[PDB]
Ligand binder design. Sequence first.
Ligand SMILES: Cc1c[n+]([C@H]2C[C@H](O)[C@@H](COP(=O)(O)OP(=O)(O)OP(=O)(O)O)O2)c(=O)[nH]c1N
Length: 128
Amino acid sequence: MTKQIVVAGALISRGTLLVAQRDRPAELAGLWELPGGKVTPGESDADALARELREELGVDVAVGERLGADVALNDAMTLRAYRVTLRSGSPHPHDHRALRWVGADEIDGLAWVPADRAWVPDLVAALS
Ligand SMILES: Cc1c[n+]([C@H]2C[C@H](O)[C@@H](COP(=O)(O)OP(=O)(O)OP(=O)(O)O)O2)c(=O)[nH]c1N
């Protein structure tokens, strides 16, 4: 068996990180994540992530290098983050409850969705 991929983006602008507050499902609603979503059939990781961020945030990004380690979300799925940079737009929460730009001092204490917490040191490092 092979695992489905979920891609997430670490958008850093002016030394701060975009985080996004989920509105669904109930178990994650109110918690914060790196925005992204499931890769659909035929898509590269970059294609999927750029599409998700265009849909969720209304921005065009360039997809860069991996950020941190892959995370086993559950027995079916693997979550991967990439550094992304803003080419065009201001993020807007189409799907999320809220967005926030956070600096290094606000990464550890943020109410992360459980899976994304694994990336805290990587995110702090990328910001420092
Ligand atoms: C983007 C993302 C997603 N995560 C989890 C939440 C879900 O259990 C699964 C899929 O993410 P989701 O954002 O729901 O993907 P969608 O593509 O929007 O899901 P569909 O409703 O299936 O389209 O990954 C997660 O833990 N962290 C994170 N940064």
